[PDB]
Amino acid sequence: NPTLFVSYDQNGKKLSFANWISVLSPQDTPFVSMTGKESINQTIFSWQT
Amino acid sequence: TLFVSYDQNGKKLSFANWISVLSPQDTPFVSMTGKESINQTIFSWQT
Amino acid sequence: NYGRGRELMYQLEKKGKEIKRDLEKILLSGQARTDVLADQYLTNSAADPAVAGLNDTHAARKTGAFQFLCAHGGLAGGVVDKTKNGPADPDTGAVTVKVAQNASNPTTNIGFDEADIFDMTLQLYTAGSEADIIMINPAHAKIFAGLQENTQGSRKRIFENTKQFIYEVNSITDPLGQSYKIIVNRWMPTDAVYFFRSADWTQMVLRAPKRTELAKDGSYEKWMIEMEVGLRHRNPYASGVLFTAAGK
Amino acid sequence: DALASVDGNNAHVEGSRAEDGEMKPTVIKSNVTQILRKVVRVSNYGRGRELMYQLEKKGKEIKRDLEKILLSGQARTDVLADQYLTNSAADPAVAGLNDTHAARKTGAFQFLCAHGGLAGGVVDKTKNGPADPDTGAVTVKVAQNASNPTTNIGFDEADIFDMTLQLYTAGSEADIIMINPAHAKIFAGLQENTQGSRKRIFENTKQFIYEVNSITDPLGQSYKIIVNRWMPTDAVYFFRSADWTQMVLRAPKRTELAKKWMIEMEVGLRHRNPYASGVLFTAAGK
Amino acid sequence: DALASVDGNNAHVEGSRAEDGEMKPTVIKSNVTQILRKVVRVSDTANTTANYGRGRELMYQLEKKGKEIKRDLEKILLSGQARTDVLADQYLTNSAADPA
Amino acid sequence: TQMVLRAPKRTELAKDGSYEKWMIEMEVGLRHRNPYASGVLFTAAGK
């Protein structure tokens, strides 16, 4: 339509989304993630105070 | 926790201009003779 | 899609992050222990009493946190009472958990008084824990900073033509020669502080984080994450905690 | 929008029997772009060619206007609110008359920073923002200067540290703070006090440095301060480089109308996440 | 979209171009892309049993069902159907149509 | 032209007490261009 270019009636638009998702969430685990493991078999363990 | 990562769908695509055309392109004179152009606004011929 | 990649791997990573956050909160919280096994013939006679024979519900399953008394005073039913001073260890005599009052400060400024830290350190010293670490949540570090501000003039800062200003404190030295470092965690009850110890106090996992799934009923994309971690302390009278001043 | 909550207890009894999950997927946010004209109209000691001079002057003026607007409290207002597409209707009564022109208004800074209201077209400067479901954090709060009996309009000594705490809880990682020169005196005097716990020293020094350009909350978050005269006096901002981006559609073009000189710059504002940046209004409660 | 309305007369003036038209997002909505379904629930004794003409009943019924779904698809594309799904596309300014 | 979503494929879902289930899950769709481009002619005895 070379006569006049109009914008409000523009059909078949392109939403122009963003290829990224800000998933910011607090998850640091400073020390508790760096303690270790003592894998066991049962679920009734103890430590003999 | 709870990573699914199946619903991104960040397509963000635009239109493609798939419109239809109905243009007849016979052009008999332009194809056979060529180009001819008058200069004045009025033209006459004798018979 | 336009911003999403897939509906399974994305959701799977989501659930993994969520399960890690859940574990982090559960370990450092008031997750009272609730078990049904009142075993009496233990100590090298491992058996389940006649009860719990054929039934397969087994609802109650929890651990840790006071109920898991952890050297606390007392809890009110299914909720941990953050108002009960701990017992006295007969070894030397020391309470590792107490509740200071908010009378030295206004009746609306919930927090410590700069003297409870040293009291806790002395209690630990008498108990012989040798703890040197602090896990505290926000809204209480400002106390660690302004301990040298809410005074009469005795303590004071200095700024020698320096454009920087600082209210950060990540270490203190007890008068007993015990150095303590501060580390901020956000999964706390925002009303207490933990004088926990180093990695010596470790946890143990029975079923590591692993995926399973059922095949199909008519149609679905089911998945599972069923880690079975558990916690463990060591000589509960060693470490200690300090609740904040609320009143009663 | 956010990650899923913690939910606290997650014990189980050897059985899933789920409810199709509680995903509750993200929310889709958008923004609009506006237009700036700054027309030029020409109808001689040293100026000579005044055209280029006035053109550069108007360019600087439009840049200043952009810097003033993007930091205002405007709120995007247009016929479309959440159904921006409406490809079916899309203002059907537009073609044929072409005189239904509405005014494109873009979203401002204070509108995208997790606001809690707006006075029609401006953000309300007396109402704190809501809380994000991920972790309880109020990134927009009404300042409360508990030092004076509501007489002086100034930041409290511990009102920016509250913002730092909230951001750390929400995980913004911002490290910049813009401020109007009508408030730098506050941070300048903050290095001193009357109780006697904070005081400068001069050990045979021929200098009187009275300035602050760095802060570190007890949480260990550094914050660099910068001054900008194009901000509203009754507000302070907590910026961050990557969290804010400037979207542009039409670059500044020097041209003329249909068959004078003029400029036309289509620009819009984008913000990665509302609960990342922080704003704080300065006033007394009433 | 629209192409033209009328041809008529082409005489024009230097100012007879006031205005004509309006603007509203396109009315092309969507296609729902219906789905098909064919299943069997053969047992084990059935798959193990034998019979004349065919072998494992399971594969026989599975192939029959494949042919049947092919026929069903071929027939559906020719019958009279109209889409009325509740997932109205409605893009474009109030896009993504997720208020329901 | 058609609008196959992923594909026509056969696969089994979770079984039962000596059952055996299978599914196809074929998903397609049509696509006409210029609705005013294909002819239709019904047959009627009258109106």
Author numbering:
A (entry chain G): 3 to 51
B (entry chain D): 5 to 51
C (entry chain G): 102 to 349
D (entry chain C): 52 to 94, 102 to 317, 323 to 349
E (entry chain E): 52 to 151
F (entry chain E): 303 to 349
The publication says:
Escherichia coli phage SU10 belongs to the genus Kuravirus from the class Caudoviricetes of phages with short non-contractile tails. Here we show that the virion of SU10 has a prolate head, containing genome and ejection proteins, and a tail, which is formed of portal, adaptor, nozzle, and tail needle proteins and decorated with long and short fibers. In contrast to other short-tailed phages, the tails of Kuraviruses elongate upon cell attachment. After binding to the host, SU10 tail, nozzle proteins, and short fibers re-arrange to form a nozzle that extends the tail.
The capsid is closed on both ends with caps formed by the major capsid proteins organized with local T = 4 quasi-icosahedral symmetry. The portal complex of SU10 is embedded in the capsid at one of its fivefold vertices, where it replaces a pentamer of capsid proteins.
